Design a protein around this nucleic acid. Sequence first.
DNA 1: GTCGG
DNA 2: GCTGATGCGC
DNA 3: CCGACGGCGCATCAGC
Length: 326
Amino acid sequence: APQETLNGGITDMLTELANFEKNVSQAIHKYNAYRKAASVIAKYPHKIKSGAEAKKLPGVGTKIAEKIDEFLATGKLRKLEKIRQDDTSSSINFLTRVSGIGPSAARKFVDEGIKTLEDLRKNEDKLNHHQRIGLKYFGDFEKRIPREEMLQMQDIVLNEVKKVDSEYIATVCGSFRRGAESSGDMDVLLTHPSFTSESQPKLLHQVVEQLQKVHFITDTLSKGETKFMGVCQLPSKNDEKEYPHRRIDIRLIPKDQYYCGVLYFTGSDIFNKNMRAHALEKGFTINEYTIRPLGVTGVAGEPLPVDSEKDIFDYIQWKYREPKDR
DNA sequence: GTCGG
DNA sequence: GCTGATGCGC
DNA sequence: CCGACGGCGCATCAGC
Ligand SMILES: Nc1ccn([C@@H]2CS[C@H](COP(=O)(O)OP(=O)(O)OP(=O)(O)O)O2)c(=O)n1
Ligand SMILES: [Ca+2]
Ligand code: NA
Ligand code: NA
Ligand code: NA
Ligand code: NA
């Protein structure tokens, strides 16, 4: 990708604007608008000289163009400069860095005078369980996970899963599966022969239990029959520095919808929107669970059989790409 | 905010 | 007690 | 002008 010093000040402007829309203004769509604008501009292989130059790019409209002009002329953006010094909105934007605190909780806390982590720390009674864990691991959750540690984590997951029941299948997806050199967290996909569309008990629970029993999983954000979100930690040696606590999700999926899942939660997700927009073009409908053919109304028929990842490149006649190229 | 019926 | 809406992460 | 913009599981709130 192009270097930061081409339009980095712009791309950071747009991203900061993105966050205020999301966290303070509660305008999710303007947030994606700004993020879209920031993406296309980060992938632009040229140093932008005017707002009109930017506006040819798809996702950049009149208002972002004129923002780019003011920033190119002056180095800053008046509106952003203002929002940054604003105690209320500043804090609201900040508190959402806590996992479990979204725009609404954040606003509600700042209302009551709870503005900082110290204030949250002082008021444990007003946070839910997810929120206490997000606060407890605030720094660890912003740290990235080098591949070396994700491979040690992968080892522990595969070993313990196979130990519970040899017939479980577990693939680790996300950035890690696309060969990424670091990762934000660990997404694991799980199936079992005795779990399909028509359907045996506790398949997700026994796995989560074994990973607690050997102290890999240290806390639970949420858990149901289908999905687990929690916290985990690699053990360190005697006298060795403690490893940060890390986020791990585990999704239990039916056998037959498993490879559509693999694909979806592999991402990248900007390849995915690309892939189904092009699967609709060639007359197929894809989502996270299945591929189905449209009868051009378009009337999706039954979901088609899928036993590998590659099948969903056969149906679309798209030339296969493995995860690294995504 | 931006795109497109 | 229950169902449905909303917040959240993603 | 003006609606679409990702959709889904789980925790927890609102309401009956
Ligand atoms: N709008 C979207 C959003 C996500 N997706 C899917 C589901 S999750 C997968 C991307 O996974 P993550 O959000 O964990 O991100 P990454 O896999 O890149 O790793 P980290 O960022 O390191 O954590 O893409 C999609 O098809 N469309
Ligand atoms: Ca991930
Ligand atoms: Na944000
Ligand atoms: Na444009
Ligand atoms: Na948050
Ligand atoms: Na994710």
